[PDB]
Design a binder for this molecule. Structure first.
Ligand SMILES: *[C@H](O)[C@H](C[C@@H]1CCNC1=O)NC(=O)[C@H](CC(C)C)NC(=O)OCC(C)(C)Oc1ccc(Cl)cc1
Ligand SMILES: *[C@H](O)[C@H](C[C@@H]1CCNC1=O)NC(=O)[C@H](CC(C)C)NC(=O)OCC(C)(C)Oc1ccc(Cl)cc1
Lengths: 299, 299
């Protein structure tokens, strides 16, 4: 059982380079529009406290250099939507996949295609944390890299990368430019509050452990939803609900282990630790696989 | 710092479906040749102890059904090379990337494009273990999935998937059909011997930890190559060598931490454990990032 990303090919063909002045980052080219973070228009002396409206007023279509491979695209319009720019170009991307824009929920997962200079460097899987950050791997030049899911042949874009927080975690927007969480695109100290553990995902991963033969942490106790949650709260775990219980249905069925039984084993792990043992090769409790991810992978 | 795979698009366009009888698995379509595991010709009653030469003698070109999307390809020749079949087809793949076949060394890493029915399902990063197994995620139908590295625009194929061992780890071949390790493609119990930890990779990951601000495990001791290795052997770690020390050069330089100093910290971690703390978000010592991987990711 592995952290598995979606195949990235459909997204690779949408990545372009966008330069304004000496600032370069990545853009996403779908039909005749290129989407990118609006801070492409900032100089380093603007990033402390930009007035983006005023900055963009000094920019014309020809100040945006958009490059797809060795091919410069012609910008024929521009507008700002929340924290993203939309650059209308004179060529529709011939590689545009079937796609939609979605705003994901916290606790859900997606794949990131990390890019530099409009060129893909690598792919990995991320969760939107309950505090609306992601634990990514991003350097200078990575902004405009996107996160996505694939359903059949349709790419659902859900994330565009903008910034790193002082804790080393990452923040960004949906493809309409609205940040996940309370963040703003300016280079000031910003707090993500307390993060919490995605309880239903830990359970899904414990189920995945059982499916893959790892069963040592199972005990002979059970518990109640309200009793467990009294333990969840203690550990900054999200409360569990019947919808969670139901979502776990397929896994609880494949394994014959009641969700509340699995909860009792989780309580003991939270209380007693793992005694130097491992679960699916990890010595910590993993919360960045959804139930769907586990079903998808073990099917 | 994340387990990061290569972008998979160039490989996605090489995957096809190969059926012989009711056995279906994946093939790799490059120029006018499709490569796949030879056990595609086995029935379930053949897999216990196949005579592949005899089995293949009863097969003709038209018994191999090769499908790329909705498109059946015409097989015009077939031959067996070690544990792979080469099916000559009448159409050269128009999506063939620049490519080579390489036999990787143990301790090196690569990306796996896990496929079913010739369709990519997901991508993840693997190391060739010192005992020539990989810790993958593979189900029935995944054989013929490949592992690769990308250098610039050139895909270096290094692995084709064939089998799971009783321990749950995975074995397969290079693209000439020669198994990594002592394995044979028959459904009998086979041992991978003792695995060992890839010492230079653990050090590279400790360097990656330091680069990313995690420094608690550093101590004020140093050691000798021979003294450390007396500790390495104790823990089934690979011995460290000057070539390893030199390969770590760039990281030792970026950090100002002598390799033998980092070795002394590693010795203490092996001896004293991690006292419930974490390094790059892991509570175990990670050995599936090479020095190159760490340089690539932190650059
Ligand atoms: C866009 O490519 C870049 C991505 C971050 C750089 C470091 N790791 C990232 O994910 N985003 C920014 O630089 C962003 C622009 C603001 C206008 C929102 N600033 C930001 O993320 O500040 C946090 C710090 C740690 C200061 O990030 C860095 C900024 C500049 C440099 Cl040279 C290094 C880090
Ligand atoms: C090829 O798609 C398949 C891949 C393994 C299936 C289970 N996980 C794998 O990686 N390879 C085989 O089935 C292989 C064929 C032999 C001719 C070499 N047999 C094999 O791997 O045996 C090990 C076991 C655990 C028996 O694998 C399974 C075989 C069949 C089935 Cl239905 C389930 C598991």
């Amino acid at each position: 059982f592995r952290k598995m990303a979606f195949p990235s090919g459909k997204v690779e063909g949408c990545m372009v380079q966008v330069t304004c002045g000496t600032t370069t980052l990545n853009g996403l080219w779908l039909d005749d529009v290129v989407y990118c973070p609006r801070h492409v228009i900032c100089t380093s002396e603007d990033m402390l406290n930009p007035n983006y409206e005023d900055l963009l007023i000094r920019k014309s279509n020809h100040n945006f250099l958009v490059q797809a491979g060795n091919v410069q695209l012609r910008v024929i319009g521009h507008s700002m939507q929340n924290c993203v720019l939309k650059l209308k170009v004179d060529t529709a991307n011939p590689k545009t996949p079937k796609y939609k824009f979605v705003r994901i929920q916290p606790g859900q997962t997606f794949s990131v295609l990390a890019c530099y200079n409009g060129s893909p460097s690598g792919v990995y899987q991320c969760a939107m944390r309950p505090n609306f950050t992601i634990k990514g791997s991003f350097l200078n030049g990575s902004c405009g890299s996107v996160g996505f899911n694939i359903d059949y042949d349709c790419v659902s874009f859900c994330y565009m990368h903008h910034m790193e927080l002082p804790t080393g975690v990452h923040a960004g927007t949906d493809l309409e430019g609205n940040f996940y969480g309370p963040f703003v695109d300016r280079q000031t100290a910003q707090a993500a509050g307390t993060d919490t553990t995605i309880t239903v995902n830990v359970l899904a991963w414990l189920y995945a452990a059982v499916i893959n033969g790892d069963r040592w942490f199972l005990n002979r106790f059970t518990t109640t939803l309200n009793d467990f949650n009294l333990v969840a709260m203690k550990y900054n775990y999200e409360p569990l609900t019947q919808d969670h219980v139901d979502i776990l249905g397929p896994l609880s069925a494949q394994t014959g282990i009641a969700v509340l039984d699995m909860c009792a084993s989780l309580k003991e792990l939270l209380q007693n630790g793992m005694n130097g043992r491992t679960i699916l090769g990890s010595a910590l409790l993993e919360d960045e696989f959804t139930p769907f991810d586990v079903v998808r992978q073990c099917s």
